[PDB]
Design a protein around this ligand. Structure first.
Ligand SMILES: *[C@@H]1O[C@H](CO)[C@@H](O[C@@H]2O[C@H](CO)[C@@H](O[C@@H]3O[C@H](CO[C@H]4O[C@H](CO[C@H]5O[C@H](CO)[C@@H](O)[C@H](O)[C@@H]5O[C@H]5O[C@H](CO)[C@@H](O)[C@H](O)[C@@H]5O)[C@@H](O)[C@H](O[C@H]5O[C@H](CO)[C@@H](O)[C@H](O)[C@@H]5O)[C@@H]4O)[C@@H](O)[C@H](O[C@H]4O[C@H](CO)[C@@H](O)[C@H](O)[C@@H]4O[C@H]4O[C@H](CO)[C@@H](O)[C@H](O)[C@@H]4O[C@H]4O[C@H](CO)[C@@H](O)[C@H](O)[C@@H]4O)[C@@H]3O)[C@H](O)[C@H]2NC(C)=O)[C@H](O)[C@H]1NC(C)=O
Ligand SMILES: *[C@@H]1O[C@H](CO)[C@@H](O[C@@H]2O[C@H](CO)[C@@H](O[C@@H]3O[C@H](CO[C@H]4O[C@H](CO)[C@@H](O)[C@H](O)[C@@H]4O)[C@@H](O)[C@H](O[C@H]4O[C@H](CO)[C@@H](O)[C@H](O)[C@@H]4O[C@H]4O[C@H](CO)[C@@H](O)[C@H](O)[C@@H]4O[C@H]4O[C@H](CO)[C@@H](O)[C@H](O)[C@@H]4O)[C@@H]3O)[C@H](O)[C@H]2NC(C)=O)[C@H](O)[C@H]1NC(C)=O
Ligand SMILES: *[C@@H]1O[C@H](CO)[C@@H](O[C@@H]2O[C@H](CO)[C@@H](O[C@@H]3O[C@H](CO)[C@@H](O)[C@H](O[C@H]4O[C@H](CO)[C@@H](O)[C@H](O)[C@@H]4O[C@H]4O[C@H](CO)[C@@H](O)[C@H](O)[C@@H]4O)[C@@H]3O)[C@H](O)[C@H]2NC(C)=O)[C@H](O)[C@H]1NC(C)=O
Ligand SMILES: *[C@@H]1O[C@H](CO)[C@@H](O[C@@H]2O[C@H](CO)[C@@H](O[C@@H]3O[C@H](CO)[C@@H](O)[C@H](O[C@H]4O[C@H](CO)[C@@H](O)[C@H](O)[C@@H]4O[C@H]4O[C@H](CO)[C@@H](O)[C@H](O)[C@@H]4O)[C@@H]3O)[C@H](O)[C@H]2NC(C)=O)[C@H](O)[C@H]1NC(C)=O
Ligand SMILES: *[C@@H]1O[C@H](CO)[C@@H](O[C@@H]2O[C@H](CO)[C@@H](O[C@@H]3O[C@H](CO)[C@@H](O)[C@H](O[C@H]4O[C@H](CO)[C@@H](O)[C@H](O)[C@@H]4O)[C@@H]3O)[C@H](O)[C@H]2NC(C)=O)[C@H](O)[C@H]1NC(C)=O
Ligand SMILES: *[C@@H]1O[C@H](CO)[C@@H](O[C@@H]2O[C@H](CO)[C@@H](O[C@@H]3O[C@H](CO)[C@@H](O)[C@H](O[C@H]4O[C@H](CO)[C@@H](O)[C@H](O)[C@@H]4O)[C@@H]3O)[C@H](O)[C@H]2NC(C)=O)[C@H](O)[C@H]1NC(C)=O
Ligand SMILES: *[C@@H]1O[C@H](CO)[C@@H](O[C@@H]2O[C@H](CO)[C@@H](O)[C@H](O)[C@H]2NC(C)=O)[C@H](O)[C@H]1NC(C)=O
Ligand SMILES: *[C@@H]1O[C@H](CO)[C@@H](O[C@@H]2O[C@H](CO)[C@@H](O)[C@H](O)[C@H]2NC(C)=O)[C@H](O)[C@H]1NC(C)=O
Ligand SMILES: *[C@@H]1O[C@H](CO)[C@@H](O[C@@H]2O[C@H](CO)[C@@H](O)[C@H](O)[C@H]2NC(C)=O)[C@H](O)[C@H]1NC(C)=O
Ligand SMILES: *[C@@H]1O[C@H](CO)[C@@H](O[C@@H]2O[C@H](CO)[C@@H](O)[C@H](O)[C@H]2NC(C)=O)[C@H](O)[C@H]1NC(C)=O
Ligand SMILES: *[C@@H]1O[C@H](CO)[C@@H](O)[C@H](O)[C@H]1NC(C)=O
Ligand SMILES: *[C@@H]1O[C@H](CO)[C@@H](O)[C@H](O)[C@H]1NC(C)=O
Ligand SMILES: *[C@@H]1O[C@H](CO)[C@@H](O)[C@H](O)[C@H]1NC(C)=O
Ligand SMILES: *[C@@H]1O[C@H](CO)[C@@H](O)[C@H](O)[C@H]1NC(C)=O
Lengths: 225, 210, 309, 36
């Protein structure tokens, strides 16, 4: 099974966050499904889950602010969190959950317990809780061992994340997109470079595909010396 | 939340559970690497999903008074990560918490040298009335690095914003430093330099307005 | 006065953790200690008290003595004698054709028990029904089995004991906190053998009530907690077993071992004794005793309509 | 433990000898019954 999240990426404080998780390659109807988040400088927090009977159960530490649902017609799991605050900023993961039984004695004496385990997970989706509007990144080319270095500056965007691609597939390696820097302005800037042959220069072509979905913005840059 | 552990490369690591079970237990072990999705390594105390290497193992609950432990034999640089022990027992109730993470570090980890690439401001950025020098540092281990900018022979104190080093998909670290100038300041000096000191050794790159 | 809370992680199940003051060995000095009580021993007014403290005084059984019944021979003095009936089909009073004489009886185990009789002597040939007025319901009914059924009784809970000194020389042994799982005491009885035994008893029962009459079995429905349950002793602890599983049947014309729930009480007044009660000291470790059910004690519901039920 | 306690109070209970009785040992004759 495959899980892919989708999200707002930016939510104002006191508003309602919403994230969705599409499942492929297995039926939604026969499984339990759950949401987990990671907030910065904290650990993985278990939010709650939904049963095959569409019954929901939630961590008390969410304080009933969370609602989890299923839409079999789109095979999609969903989650809303109302009344968010900056602590609700987090990568949000959707996962499968299996029920197991730990039995230590007699069933009738109730001498057993249930536990769950998450065997399949999503990549996560970044969701930020912040006042400001989306800001598109101005992108600037960074001009060029028998190799040269080539790059694109992705300047002053908000919020994270930015996707960077080069020619799509052909430039897969050796290409390195560095972590971004959080400016004192609160803007983000990253860089993406690739190592190329000096002889290829002036004869070949390279551009970087810069995606800022929250902007949302789209651009390409032709790098030239 | 973080509990640091350091292990020599190629030996057997033993990660204790944060909690000791009141009653007979079902423990799950998750591996979480920064910026990636967590992985289920062990479920039901000792059971291993398909694809998880038989290098990892847990302690079975035979009712002996033995704490939940995660064993990793032949520990590799790729096993550097956080390990959480999800503990279910009969007298605790439904356990919402994953517990704290044991941060595993692999060690006598060779001391690789950093690679450094310095880019001058773009012709476009200067026509946009901005200038930023970009110093990229990659492929180093260990992760501690010091980056200093110089204008000619003197140290720039500001305009400098640097990312914290983090491990990349070749298990080595990478960081970037950005020095933003005004175009007139850029044309002002003969040269700017990005100087990186790693493990006592110092290397440097240089660019000039042209 | 005991300040008590429920255990706290009780999913489906009673025993309570209490704290209280206690006189130490010095009269003047006091100690605050805690003990675990099965909730039969305490009652409330969270504040609690022991059940016994308004009815009678209490004394603690010495730890050394054992409650494991051993055969005892009753002897008559010289000049007197004991006559022993060896008639197999002996129906409970009457003339015994085959009689032998002894100065002392055989080893009789003083097994303290309720409802079902334990570790006794088995009647040869047919199972034997002994009463005093068969048409009368008020008088109980004694049953002696020919085949003993096997009953395995265990207290799974890991009981730990501590010793707190409450006065000069005096030392109370209290139930420490349990280590490991919380399981309730129980008793197993092979359903096959118990169904055979129950069959054979009703065969001999119908000899006194005409021949295809409806013979059903129901639970105890009268009297106090101490009498309605199969009370007995095992390893030191006093078990109060609910026997609803066995006596839930109706007769006309895998292993599947039955399981019986047992509660535990440490304050006891057996044989209708009101006055000086006993505190059964807690027993360290897990308990398991295997016993025989050699007899039974039954009672009718009343004048029955006679050939009706 | 200036505070003190009696040595015995943690080992056993205690009782006071009556004043009247004397601990002055007197000759005692051990006798066997008739036939022995
Ligand atoms: C009076 O009579 C009373 C009743 O009449 C009686 O009460 C009984 O008490 C006993 C204990 O005294 C109870 O016994 C326990 O039984 C548990 C359940 O056992 C059954 O189920 C398991 C597991 O099966 C599931 O998983 C497997 C995975 O392979 C699947 O294949 C199965 O299909 C099944 O999955 C279904 O069920 C799930 C729910 O459980 C569902 O979610 C799922 O969707 C599926 O539908 C079977 O493996 C058992 O079979 C084995 O045992 C039988 C004998 O019973 C053998 O004939 C057979 O060959 C097998 O060996 C069985 O069918 C046990 O789990 C439990 O034992 C564990 O707990 C104790 C302590 O709490 C541990 O000390 C012990 O080690 C066991 O732990 C192991 O398993 C856990 C949980 O999985 C692990 O986390 C743990 O680490 C440990 O693993 C280790 O051991 C494994 C082998 O056990 C080994 O594989 C591992 O590699 C590792 O080393 C315990 O035995 C019994 O239930 C009571 N009866 C009732 C009705 O409740 C009472 O005692 C009598 N009184 C007397 C006599 O005085
Ligand atoms: C119907 O008939 C059947 C058949 O007889 C009955 O089933 C029997 O029931 C017996 C009593 O209920 C039970 O006997 C007990 O067995 C325990 C386990 O036995 C094992 O060890 C012996 C060797 O000692 C082996 O031969 C045997 O094979 C087993 O391996 C014993 O441990 C029990 O002894 C203890 O309890 C009795 C009270 O019942 C005490 O008098 C005795 O001193 C023992 O207590 C000490 O040890 C325990 C250990 O946990 C301590 O907790 C406790 O504080 C005591 O420790 C103090 O004293 C020691 C010694 O002075 C000292 O060193 C220490 O420091 C402490 O101060 C007991 O013997 C039979 O096992 C059982 N038969 C079978 C086959 O299973 C059935 O009950 C009958 N039905 C009914 C209703 O009664
Ligand atoms: C020392 O203390 C212990 C414990 O603290 C005492 O043990 C308890 O004793 C009390 C009363 O003595 C007893 O309570 C009764 O239990 C009966 C059996 O379970 C109940 O049937 C009875 O209920 C009736 O009385 C209630 C008022 O108390 C009414 O509210 C209720 O509706 C019942 O009344 C109906 O029935 C009667 C009789 O048919 C009728 O007249 C009425 O009109 C009405 O129809 C009580 O609840 C406890 O059960 C005992 N506790 C335990 C654990 O056994 C012990 O008695 C004290 N010692 C001495 C010497 O008194
Ligand atoms: C009730 O109270 C009365 C009085 O309050 C108790 O009587 C006293 O009991 C204590 C201990 O029970 C006893 O103290 C010991 O006396 C021994 C004999 O004189 C000493 O040899 C012993 O010393 C060892 O233990 C000390 C720690 O307590 C150490 O500091 C010391 O170094 C000694 O240890 C060495 O020796 C041991 C054994 O060889 C060895 O393992 C060690 O490694 C080390 O080498 C104690 O001082 C008093 O003497 C008793 N008082 C009187 C007046 O007789 C009574 O016991 C209490 N009742 C009960 C039931 O306990
Ligand atoms: C049955 O009741 C008895 C009452 O006598 C009970 O014994 C006591 O239980 C409490 C449970 O809170 C114990 O208190 C704990 O003691 C430990 C060790 O000293 C502390 O670390 C604990 O502090 C943590 O938890 C607090 C909860 O609010 C937090 O605020 C705090 O920051 C810590 O995280 C806690 O104070 C107490 O020690 C025992 N008493 C004795 C004498 O042992 C017994 O546990 C109850 N039974 C069961 C099964 O729980
Ligand atoms: C009921 O609960 C109690 C807990 O209060 C429990 O008692 C514990 O049992 C174990 C035995 O199963 C005891 O462990 C032993 O203790 C002795 C004395 O300290 C040690 O010598 C033993 O060491 C051996 O085992 C080691 C294993 O690593 C070896 O390394 C070593 O070389 C020895 O071979 C062992 O540790 C434990 O001390 C008690 N605890 C207490 C407080 O008494 C009891 O088992 C439970 N009851 C039942 C019936 O299970
Ligand atoms: C056991 O059975 C015998 C039958 O042999 C009973 O003895 C008879 O009892 C009746 C009353 O029930 C008397 O009228 C007869 O005189 C007795 N007959 C003989 C031959 O003695 C005996 O009562 C039965 N015992 C019980 C407890 O029912
Ligand atoms: C419980 O019943 C069993 C039989 O089910 C008894 O075991 C027999 O004991 C006698 C001694 O009276 C031996 O001669 C037999 O050989 C035993 N049977 C077997 C199959 O070995 C046991 O003694 C009874 N327990 C009691 C009365 O405490
Ligand atoms: C009570 O316990 C005894 C012994 O622990 C049980 O006897 C066992 O029975 C099974 C077959 O049902 C045999 O495989 C074992 O070999 C027996 N054990 C021994 C030591 O002989 C008996 O079945 C138990 N009774 C109940 C009702 O469960
Ligand atoms: C012993 O177990 C039986 C279960 O069979 C209990 O019987 C129940 O009692 C309640 C009233 O207390 C009735 O309303 C239920 O209908 C009974 N259950 C059934 C299945 O008929 C009984 O109370 C238990 N006895 C004790 C003393 O705890
Ligand atoms: C012990 O006695 C004191 C009075 O000094 C009281 O306050 C306390 O509640 C008592 N202990 C318990 C467990 O109630
Ligand atoms: C005993 O049974 C006889 C038989 O008819 C009956 O007459 C008598 O009243 C009964 N005795 C008692 C005390 O019930
Ligand atoms: C009842 O059945 C027994 C055994 O078959 C038989 O001996 C007896 O005659 C029957 N009684 C009547 C009244 O038919
Ligand atoms: C025990 O009695 C209950 C109540 O009528 C009934 O539901 C159950 O089937 C009975 N058990 C057996 C084994 O007959």
């Amino acid at each position: 099974v495959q899980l892919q999240e989708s999200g707002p990426g930016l939510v104002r404080p006191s508003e309602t966050l919403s994230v969705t998780c599409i499942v492929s390659g297995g039926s939604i109807s026969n499984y339990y499904w759950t949401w987990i988040r990671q907030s910065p400088g904290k650990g993985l927090e278990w939010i709650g889950y939904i049963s095959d009977r569409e019954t929901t159960t939630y961590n008390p530490s969410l304080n009933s602010r969370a609602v989890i649902s299923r839409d079999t017609s789109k095979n999609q799991l969903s989650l809303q969190l109302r009344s968010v605050t900056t602590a609700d900023t987090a990568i949000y993961f959707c996962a499968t959950a299996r029920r197991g039984q730990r039995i230590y004695g007699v069933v009738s004496f109730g001498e057993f317990f249930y536990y769950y385990y998450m065997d399949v997970w999503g990549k996560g989706t970044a969701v930020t809780v912040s006042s400001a509007s989306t800001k598109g990144p101005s992108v600037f080319p960074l001009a060029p061992g028998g190799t040269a270095a080539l790059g694109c500056l992705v300047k002053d965007y908000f919020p994270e994340p930015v996707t960077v691609s080069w020619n799509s597939g052909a430039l897969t390696s050796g290409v390195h997109t560095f972590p971004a820097v959080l400016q004192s302005s609160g803007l983000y800037s990253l860089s993406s470079v690739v190592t190329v042959p000096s002889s290829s220069l002036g004869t070949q072509t390279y551009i970087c595909n810069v995606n800022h979905k929250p902007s949302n913005t789209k651009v390409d840059k032709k790098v030239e010396p | 939340y973080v509990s640091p552990l350091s292990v020599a490369l190629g030996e057997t690591a033993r990660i204790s559970c944060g909690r000791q079970a009141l009653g007979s237990r079902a423990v799950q072990w998750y591996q979480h690497k920064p910026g990636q999705a967590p992985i289920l390594l062990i479920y039901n105390n000792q059971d291993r999903p398909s694809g998880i290497p038989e290098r990892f193992s847990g302690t079975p609950d035979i009712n002996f008074g033995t704490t939940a432990t995660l064993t990793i034999s032949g520990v590799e640089v790729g096993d550097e990560a956080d390990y959480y022990c999800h503990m279910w027992d009969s007298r605790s109730g439904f356990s919402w918490s994953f517990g704290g993470a044991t941060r595993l570090t692999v060690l006598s980890q060779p001391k690789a040298a950093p690679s450094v690439t310095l880019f001058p401001p773009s012709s476009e950025e200067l026509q946009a009335n901005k200038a930023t020098l970009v110093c990229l540092i990659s492929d180093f281990y260990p992760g501690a690095v010091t980056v200093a900018w110089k204008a000619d022979s003197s140290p720039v104190k500001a305009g400098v914003e640097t990312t914290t080093p983090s491990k990349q998909s070749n298990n080595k670290y990478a960081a970037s430093s950005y020095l933003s100038l005004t175009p007139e300041q850029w044309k002002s000096h003969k040269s700017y330099s990005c100087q990186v000191t790693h493990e006592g050794s110092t290397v440097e790159k240089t660019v000039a307005p042209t | 006065t005991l300040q008590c809370t429920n255990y706290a992680p009780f999913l489906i199940n009673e025993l309570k953790n209490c704290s209280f003051n206690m006189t130490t060995e010095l009269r003047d000095k006091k100690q605050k200690v805690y003990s675990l009580f099965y909730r039969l021993d305490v009652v409330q007014i969270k504040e609690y008290r022991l059940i016994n403290c308004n009815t009678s005084a209490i004394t603690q059984a010495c730890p050394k003595v054992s409650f494991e019944p051993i055969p005892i021979h009753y002897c008559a003095p010289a000049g007197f004698a004991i006559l022993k009936c060896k008639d197999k089909k002996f129906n409970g009073t009457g003339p015994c054709p085959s009689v032998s004489t002894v100065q002392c009886t055989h080893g009789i185990k003083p097994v303290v028990s309720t409802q079902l009789l334990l570790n006794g002597s088995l009647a040869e040939e047919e199972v034997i029904i002994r009463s005093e007025n068969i048409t009368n319901n008020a008088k109980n009914i004694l049953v002696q089995l020919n085949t003993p059924v096997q009953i395995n009784c265990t207290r799974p809970n890991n009981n730990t004991v501590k010793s707190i000194r409450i006065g000069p020389g005096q030392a109370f042994y209290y139930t420490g906190d349990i280590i490991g799982d919380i399981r309730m005491a129980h008793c197993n009885v092979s359903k096959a053998t118990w169904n055979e035994t129950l069959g054979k008893v009703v065969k001999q029962l119908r000899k006194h009530f005409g021949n295809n009459t409806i013979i059903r079995f129901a639970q105890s429905s009268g009297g106090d907690l101490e009498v309605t349950t199969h009370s007995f002793n095992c390893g030191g602890e006093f078990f109060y077993c609910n026997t609803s599983g066995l006596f839930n049947s109706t007769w006309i014309s895998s292993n599947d071992s039955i399981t019986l729930p047992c509660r535990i009480k440490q304050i006891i007044n057996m044989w209708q004794r009101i006055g000086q009660a006993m505190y059964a000291p807690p027993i360290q470790g897990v308990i398991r005793c295997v016993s025989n059910i050699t007899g039974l004690i039954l009672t009718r519901d009343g004048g029955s309509t006679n050939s009706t039920t």
